[PDB]
């Protein structure tokens, strides 16, 4: 035939090539052993590239399966790792050949550091969350001030604050911090 | 001897399976634009296994012949992914590549692996920072960005200007807040 197109590589295991052909442009790695994956590498064998304005949107399924968008490979950036531990125990990486157009309009979560990116903005909300709860019962104007000249205060809005200094630095870059 | 036995992988780019054949039992991959990488991919190609009793010790070279120990692959764990930014030079195991030709530049790196046996491997010592836990960096350095940032606003009543619609909060809060907050995430990093 023209072969495999893909591997698909468990850290601490062997490369994976044989995917299995769900649809015409779609294929899937079954993978043993969920609870022991921590990493994934999936990438071009560099023997078939994609289709002229395609690409490839990667998936992931974890026990129901559930699928999340992990990322993308392109024969420009024909490898990716994701950290581990629509159009589709036991695991699944799927590889679906999708429009490079397409592509730049969907927001993946995989990362090659964390499982996904929205556990950095799900941990702040919750840290600042947590203060706020904590703080606020001791929360006063100036007016329900007293008289103590040397204490010291912390204006309230620095949680606003921090928080939109956060997204920022995140939006540029997920491990900014790294 | 072994022939193409293993690969070596940069996220963003092509495997690679050609290794320069530095001696029968050593494998070396050169790594072009070396300071635009951060992790390494190593793994077995599953074309023959390891002969009895070996395994594989994974080597890197960077610019200041000598080599880091990254860590290992075996007939067990055939593959491993090892973080190469951020090493601190001098530690580690010593090198076994003597081979008079390792051409080399402060732009390319090398990733180099020697089987060894798995008795001599069970000796080595890596490097730290090596192996690939992040998450918990992160939430660690949040808290402290954060009570830093904070901090950096407190204000004592005289110095302060006049905004009847803002509220305040004293200082030893914020400062409890962020001890027991520290406290409780290094008994239980998932507690929140």
Redesign the interface.
């Known amino acids: 035939a023209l072969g495999s197109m893909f591997?698909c590589?468990?850290?601490?295991?062997?490369?994976q090539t044989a995917a299995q052909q769900v649809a015409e442009d779609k294929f899937v790695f079954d993978l043993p052993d969920y609870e022991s994956i921590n990493?994934v590498?999936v990438?071009?064998?560099?023997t078939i590239p994609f289709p002229e304005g395609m690409g490839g949107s990667v998936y992931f399924s974890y026990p129901m399966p559930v699928w999340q968008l992990l990322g993308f490979v392109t024969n420009g950036?024909?490898?990716?790792?994701f950290?581990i531990s629509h159009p589709f125990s036991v695991a699944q990486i799927g590889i679906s050949v999708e429009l490079l157009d397409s592509m730049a309009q969907q927001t993946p979560v995989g990362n090659?550091?964390?499982s996904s990116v929205d556990?950095?903005t799900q941990?702040?909300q919750?840290?600042?969350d947590?203060?706020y709860n904590?703080?606020s019962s001791?929360?006063?104007?100036?007016?329900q001030?007293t008289?103590?000249?040397?204490?010291?205060?912390?204006?309230?809005?620095?949680?606003l604050?921090?928080y939109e200094?956060?997204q920022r630095r995140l939006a540029q870059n997920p491990l900014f911090?790294?």
């Open positions: 591997g590589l468990v850290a601490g295991r062997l490369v990493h590498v990438f071009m064998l560099g950036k024909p490898s990716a790792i950290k090659a550091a964390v556990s950095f941990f702040t919750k840290m600042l947590n203060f904590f703080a001791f929360a006063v104007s100036q007016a001030m008289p103590s000249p040397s204490e010291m205060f912390i204006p309230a809005n620095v949680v604050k921090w200094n956060f911090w790294k």
